[PDB]
Amino acid sequence: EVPLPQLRAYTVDASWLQPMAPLQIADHTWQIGTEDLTALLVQTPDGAVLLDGGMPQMASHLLDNMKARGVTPRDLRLILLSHAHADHAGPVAELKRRTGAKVAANAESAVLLARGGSDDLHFGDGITYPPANADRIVMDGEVITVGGIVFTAHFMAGHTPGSTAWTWTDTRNGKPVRIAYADSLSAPGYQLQGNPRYPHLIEDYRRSFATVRALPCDVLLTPHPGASNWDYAAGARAGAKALTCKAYADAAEQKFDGQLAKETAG
Amino acid sequence: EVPLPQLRAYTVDASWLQPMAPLQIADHTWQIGTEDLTALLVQTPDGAVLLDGGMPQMASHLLDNMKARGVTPRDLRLILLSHAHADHAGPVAELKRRTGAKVAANAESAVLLARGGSDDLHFGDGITYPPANADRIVMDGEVITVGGIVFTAHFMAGHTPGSTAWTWTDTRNGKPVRIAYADSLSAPGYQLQGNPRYPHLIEDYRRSFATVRALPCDVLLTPHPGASNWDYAAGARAGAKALTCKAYADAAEQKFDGQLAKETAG
Amino acid sequence: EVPLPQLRAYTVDASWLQPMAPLQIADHTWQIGTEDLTALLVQTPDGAVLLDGGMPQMASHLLDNMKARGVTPRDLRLILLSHAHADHAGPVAELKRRTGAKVAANAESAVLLARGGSDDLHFGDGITYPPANADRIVMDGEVITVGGIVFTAHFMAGHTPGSTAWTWTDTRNGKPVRIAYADSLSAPGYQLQGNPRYPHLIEDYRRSFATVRALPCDVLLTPHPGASNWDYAAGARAGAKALTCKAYADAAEQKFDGQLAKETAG
Amino acid sequence: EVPLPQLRAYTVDASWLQPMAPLQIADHTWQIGTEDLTALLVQTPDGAVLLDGGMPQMASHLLDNMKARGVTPRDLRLILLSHAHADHAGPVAELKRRTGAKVAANAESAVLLARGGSDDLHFGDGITYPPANADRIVMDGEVITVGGIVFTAHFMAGHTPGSTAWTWTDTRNGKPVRIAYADSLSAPGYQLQGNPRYPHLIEDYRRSFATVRALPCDVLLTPHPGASNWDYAAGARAGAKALTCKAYADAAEQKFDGQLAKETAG
Ligand SMILES: C=C1CO[C@H]([C@@](NC(=O)[C@H](C(=O)O)c2ccc(O)cc2)(OC)C(=O)O)N=C1C(=O)O
Ligand SMILES: C=C1CO[C@H]([C@@](NC(=O)[C@H](C(=O)O)c2ccc(O)cc2)(OC)C(=O)O)N=C1C(=O)O
Ligand SMILES: C=C1CO[C@H]([C@@](NC(=O)[C@H](C(=O)O)c2ccc(O)cc2)(OC)C(=O)O)N=C1C(=O)O
Ligand SMILES: C=C1CO[C@H]([C@@](NC(=O)[C@H](C(=O)O)c2ccc(O)cc2)(OC)C(=O)O)N=C1C(=O)O
Ligand SMILES: [Zn+2]
Ligand SMILES: [Zn+2]
Ligand SMILES: [Zn+2]
Ligand SMILES: [Zn+2]
Ligand SMILES: [Zn+2]
Ligand SMILES: [Zn+2]
Ligand SMILES: [Zn+2]
Ligand SMILES: [Zn+2]
């Protein structure tokens, strides 16, 4: 007899799960995730902000790195997200349980997070993770100021409907540094043209390349560091090769155009 | 280097995933799940009721069996649950999307279902599944009548806080048959004594053995058919060896007492 | 002493609460709400669709009109919404409890509906109503076909972030009739310029006037019938004076421009 | 013509809305609500806890009193609830938005809070308020320790399914003071016998009188101070006349027995 298949776990390259110590980006901003997944800690005189958590199993590691940075569970005030896929919002439910953190997200990201990434537009139920509730819904261009660090939301729908770039100005050498944490612009295996679950997908991606291109962007970071040419394992040279927002947007668009062409042929 | 572990899928014995054709229990009541997981279809002149769905991957199989029984997606009106673990409520979200079915459950089951079984009192995040919302909250002893089949809820907290027995009266040979679909009474690997997440666990199990013992119970069925000595693969003899509610309750209590003793020693 | 003020009820002009009998718009489409609030019943060989319900207290009236049309609670399959304010989505929770109806809405409308219209961007908590959950999230341009009546979503953010026009093709005289149920385009008392809760409000309204202008639109209907020059109390002449989508959009834009000017002056 | 009735606001005696300054109960515990609604602030070296908020319109007043006590919005860590009716959990949604506070409640209270008290077992939709999500679900007898103040949940179902007494030990004069914040035990206008929405109502009330009777209870407080003979307007004598838990339970039971008799006659 042939039974139905076993459930399949969402497995990822080992590097995405490889713990790293905190890597400083600017005076208040640290990469505290893994070698190949971004989780940004921003430390304020009025508590901390986390942008992304990576995979579900990273919760304790993130907590460890926060502790090394001087941040206790009570000190974590806000979680922001690029997009609510398992490899970026994975540990959010657990972080909410174990810290003081509240989540702010747009409606699309909130709805996807609340269903734990199940019924994904492209990936079905294959990337389900523990669901969490958003505490605050943000609109496009809305600001959240935490201890004078002002975070601005820039919607960049495509990779998910709720995909968001987050921007803020930190310092280095008494000089302002405009950090752009731009979301993914990939469409891996997606049906792009005439997708019934996402009829305006192509229009949304096109608008998003333009949005990303135009961001205040002294330093670009991305959920997958490779997408912006960061190498978190490279120490003092980790960001040396980083793309500009312009170059990231252009590369993503050129890739997308190729994908569209391949789809038409397939 | 040592990366964090990959996520682990909730895997189960093959028999739990082995499709079977509909097996009739009484005039209106059919087992439509797998060889080792119960999913009961109750067919009414006013639409159908499903009690449990088994594992997440069983959704399509259940839909196939409903079709064989004369039940289209539109005809499925109500889903009831024993308890909201992945191996019983697994396909509920998908069934809601693909049919007309609404879910009725107690508060505890609703809350656990809404978080997709994540943050389980005993199993942590190991048995997460797609979350779903309950459409109706039921109280202990509350009835839901569907086309003259009256279903009564009997709370039997223990295996989960929201564990419920469902009872209804069907017919065979113009004679009433009082069917008791009693939930699990196991506590696999549970910390029973002084559990901070479930301080009254032992008291709740004791009350539940008494509840199960007293059910109107011409025929007992259970989420795992083996627990009540059903053999779904045995055709005309499938229920021949079935326990009474009294015997099921007594066996569960004797097992529980042994577990309590082993725990004290361990 | 001065106590805090009593809670204030959301009160409305009497005409918004004045029951009317079903008024036919096309072969399958009926106005079944009140004299001054639209609630559209669309009747299909495969069940019925309701677009809007009006105020919370209209639930029973709507049920009465459905019954007069041949539609039992079981027959109501789908609820669609213009926007999730109390005067349009008011009875949705109750309708879900009392019928087979499931709700399909965009993420913004779902989030606002789920909080019962509380924490409104402009109206605070003044228009709270019973919350309800969406069963299906729709994307811009997505279709929902019910018994061959195909409903297309057209996002028209402004009045609320989740404001939606719904379009479908019915018949009259063996001729197709393209019905456009366009949402409100008002901004009553709203802060339009530099609104921190809605930074791109003006851009969204401008885009929405263009969206409405371009709809397939043999017949325009609106949540407040007066907005499209319908007079539901006028019998055979109820729609005689109805605006085109073009004229509705233009009037709304001219009004909006005046409001923007008044705001700058104020 | 006769339109449907306007929505009716939930109005209350003026005294329930009469602001008062903080009134100290024990070293760490203050009444910060109104003259006739309890809202208890418990202040810890590790942040503050609020038990109840009273009516929806009390949010700002509570925030004012917290400020007078040395408690900023960031310092408020936890909200606990007696039961999730509008006159006790009314401002919870707003408090969550305006402070760092997370909510811990049992499943029943969470479900009722999440629907903003709509579809109440006895009161229909008449007492709807802004909905809020619970951050943590508590079981009967579960403890939540905040800065060494240990709060224990004691379920006392009846007034609502999720009705809870909260107990903790504070100090006065270097002596322990066991504070019992016991929920309401009233059943105003309720159908007690054979209520289809609450079939075991009488059994639950009986169990709850016994639970309340047995609480660790040097000092009893109740959501409506009059129920335990507190007079918050009486300064140094505010609690002089307070009932014991035993006397509160007995009075509630005697009242309940009278109600049951009146119901049988009616
Ligand atoms: C470029 C990628 C590809 O890898 C991840 C992704 N995909 C995967 O990890 C991977 C895949 O696309 O092959 C995948 C594995 C298993 C699945 O069930 C689904 C997706 O995360 C869910 C995705 O969003 O596409 N994320 C990105 C991204 O840009 O964020
Ligand atoms: C007797 C059992 C044991 O098997 C399942 C159960 N457990 C398992 O399937 C199994 C286990 O207990 O060993 C399990 C595997 C993997 C996990 O991550 C958690 C549990 O389902 C979640 C459970 O509820 O205990 N269900 C029952 C039951 O009585 O319902
Ligand atoms: C043109 C209007 C004005 O009336 C309603 C509205 N407003 C009111 O009914 C009314 C008002 O704007 O004066 C109102 C009364 C009381 C309140 O607390 C809030 C709003 O419904 C909530 C609104 O959305 O603006 N709806 C529309 C509309 O276009 O949908
Ligand atoms: C003793 C009472 C009576 O007053 C309130 C109550 N009731 C009312 O305030 C009041 C009433 O019962 O008459 C009421 C007014 C208006 C309504 O729509 C519903 C109830 O709050 C909702 C209730 O829970 O019964 N609360 C209690 C209580 O014990 O908590
Ligand atoms: Zn992704
Ligand atoms: Zn990714
Ligand atoms: Zn189980
Ligand atoms: Zn099981
Ligand atoms: Zn409106
Ligand atoms: Zn309106
Ligand atoms: Zn009450
Ligand atoms: Zn009360």
Of D6, D18, D125, the CB nearest to C3: D18
The tokens 């959301």 sit on which residue? Answer: C10
The tokens 């199989």 sit on which residue? Answer: B61
The dihedral built from the CA positions of residue A36, A42, A43 and A48, taken in this order, carries a sign that is negative
From the list B160, B210, B211, the residue with the least C-alpha distance to D139 is B160
HEC letters along C4-66: CCCCCCCCCCHHHHCECCCEEEECCEEECCECCCCCEEEEECCEEEEECCECHHHHHHHHHHH
CA C89 to chain centre: 8
Q: Which tokens sit at A136?
A: 């605050």
Q: How far is the CA of D98 from the centre of ligand 12 (A)?
A: 24
Set of chain A residues whose Cβ sits within 8 Å of the Cβ of D134: none
Interface of D with C (CB under 8 A): 1, 3-12, 14-15, 17-19, 34, 55-58, 61, 93-94, 97, 114-116, 118-119, 125, 128-131
Please name each of the domains of chain D with its CATH number.
1-266 (3.60.15.10)
* H or E stretch at D257: helix D245-265
Q: For residue B186, how many other CB atoms are within 10 A of its CB?
A: 17
From the CB of A85, is ligand 1 less than 6 Å away?
Answer: yes
User: Distance (Å, rounded) from C-alpha A135 to C-alpha A130?
Assistant: 16
* Residue B81 DSSP label: -
From the list D165, D91, D171, the residue with the least C-alpha distance to D132 is D91
The dihedral built from the CA positions of residue D92, D98, D104 and D108, taken in this order, carries a sign that is positive
Amino acid (1-letter code) at residue B74: R
Told to judge if D159 belongs to the known catalytic residues of this protein, a careful annotator would answer yes
Contact D94, D67 (CB under 8 A): no
User: Distance (Å, rounded) from C-alpha D182 to C-alpha A97?
Assistant: 27
Could you tell me which residues of B are annotated as the binding site for substrate? 183
Q: Which tokens sit at D1?
A: 């013509």
Told to judge if D224 belongs to the known catalytic residues of this protein, a careful annotator would answer yes
Query: What approach was used to elucidate this structure?
Result: X-ray
Q: Which residues contact A247 (CB under 8 A, 6 or more apart)?
A: none
Q: How far is the CA of D248 from the centre of ligand 11 (A)?
A: 16
Q: For residue A148, how many other CB atoms are within 10 A of its CB?
A: 10
Nearest CA in chain A to B11: A6
Long-range contacts of B147-155 (CB under 8 A, 24+ apart): B147/B44, B147/B45, B147/B46, B147/B47, B148/B44, B148/B45, B148/B46, B149/B28, B149/B42, B149/B44, B149/B49, B151/B49, B151/B80, B153/B106, B154/B211, B154/B215, B155/B106, B155/B211
Set of chain C residues whose Cβ sits within 8 Å of the Cβ of A143: 196
Told to judge if C122 belongs to the known catalytic residues of this protein, a careful annotator would answer no
- 3-state class (DSSP) for residue D179: strand
From the CB of B120, is ligand 2 less than 6 Å away?
Answer: no
From the CB of A186, is ligand 1 less than 6 Å away?
Answer: yes
From the list A137, A36, A128, the residue with the least C-alpha distance to A85 is A128
CA D69 to chain centre: 21
Q: Report in angstroms the alpha-carbon separations of C12 from B39, C9, C54, C59, C86.
A: 49, 10, 11, 16, 11
User: Distance (Å, rounded) from C-alpha A82 to C-alpha A52?
Assistant: 7
Least distant ligand from the CA of C84: 9
Set of chain A residues whose Cβ sits within 8 Å of the Cβ of B131: 114-116, 118, 131
Beta carbon pairs, B and D, within 8 Å: 44
User: Distance (Å, rounded) from C-alpha B266 to C-alpha A191?
Assistant: 55
User: Distance (Å, rounded) from C-alpha A143 to C-alpha A133?
Assistant: 20
From the CB of B188, is ligand 2 less than 6 Å away?
Answer: yes
Residue nearest to atom 17 of ligand 1 (CA): A126
Residue nearest to atom 20 of ligand 2 (CA): B123
Q: Which tokens sit at B192?
A: 């029973």
List, by residue number, the catalytic residues of B: 83, 85, 87-88, 159, 190, 224
Contact A77, A42 (CB under 8 A): no
From the CB of B16, is ligand 2 less than 6 Å away?
Answer: no
Told to judge if C85 belongs to the known catalytic residues of this protein, a careful annotator would answer yes
End-to-end CA distance of chain D: 35
Interface of C with A (CB under 8 A): 107-108, 110-111, 121, 137, 139-143, 161-162, 196-200
Contact C20, C35 (CB under 8 A): yes
Q: How far is the CA of C145 from the centre of ligand 5 (A)?
A: 29
Q: Report in angstroms the alpha-carbon separations of C175 from C43, C170, C171, C172, C237.
A: 18, 9, 5, 5, 20
Longest dimension (CA), chain C: 70
From the list A64, A58, A11, A60, the residue with the least C-alpha distance to A37 is A58
From the CB of B87, is ligand 2 less than 6 Å away?
Answer: yes
Contact A188, A194 (CB under 8 A): no
- Closest ligand 3 atom to Cα of C185: 29
From the list C108, C102, C194, the residue with the least C-alpha distance to C157 is C108
Q: How far is the CA of C7 from the centre of ligand 10 (A)?
A: 21
User: Distance (Å, rounded) from C-alpha B153 to C-alpha B216?
Assistant: 12
Question: Pairing relation of β-strands A136-137 and A102-105?
Answer: parallel
Header resolution in angstroms: 1.7
- 3-state class (DSSP) for residue B26: strand
Is A119 in Cβ contact with B56 (below 8 Å)?
no
Q: Report in angstroms the alpha-carbon separations of A19 from A62, A72, A96, C238.
A: 9, 19, 21, 68
Told to judge if C154 belongs to the known catalytic residues of this protein, a careful annotator would answer no
- Dihedral of CA atoms D114, C103, B69, B29 in degrees, nearest 10, equals 20
Told to judge if A122 belongs to the known catalytic residues of this protein, a careful annotator would answer no
> Per residue in C243-258, is it b (16+ CB within 10 Å) or e — as a string?
bbbeebbebbbeebee
Q: What are phi and psi of B131, to 5 degrees?
A: -70, 155
Of B4, B114, B128, the CB nearest to A128: B128
From the CB of A87, is ligand 1 less than 6 Å away?
Answer: yes
Q: How far is the CA of C154 from the centre of ligand 10 (A)?
A: 18
Q: Which tokens sit at D167?
A: 């107990």
Is C96 in Cβ contact with B135 (below 8 Å)?
yes
Question: Pairing relation of β-strands B175-181 and B219-221?
Answer: parallel
Q: Which residues contact A153 (CB under 8 A, 6 or more apart)?
A: A106, A138, A139, A140, A141, A142, A143, A144, A164, A165, A166
- Closest ligand 4 atom to Cα of D189: 12
User: Distance (Å, rounded) from C-alpha B181 to C-alpha B154?
Assistant: 10
CA B203 to chain centre: 21
